[PDB]
Amino acid sequence: QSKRVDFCGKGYHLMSFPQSAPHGVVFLHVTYVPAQEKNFTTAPAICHDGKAHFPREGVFVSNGTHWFVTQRNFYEPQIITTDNTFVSGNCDVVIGIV
């Protein structure tokens, strides 16, 4: 599985299937294409009680009322816990913290 962009087809590469051809080879590049996106209000960090919280694997998004952690390439909102986030520094140094 190649992480090289557009080396194995347009999109995020999953598999490829070779096929025999006259004087050549034909690859069937199976790629992952994102679709049906939505706008979300984001923030670099969450300030809880003086500590700055950053996502371990995901991203802080908001639907307008509540903030969630979702993974980066698929919308799957989760409650912001200390299992999803990690603590570094304080709230005075991060620009855009909420």
Partner: peptide
Amino acid sequence: NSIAIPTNFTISVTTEI
């Protein structure tokens, strides 16, 4: 302060001769 995240996806197969 705005990000776009997909809610669905499309499995695409393309040819390379």
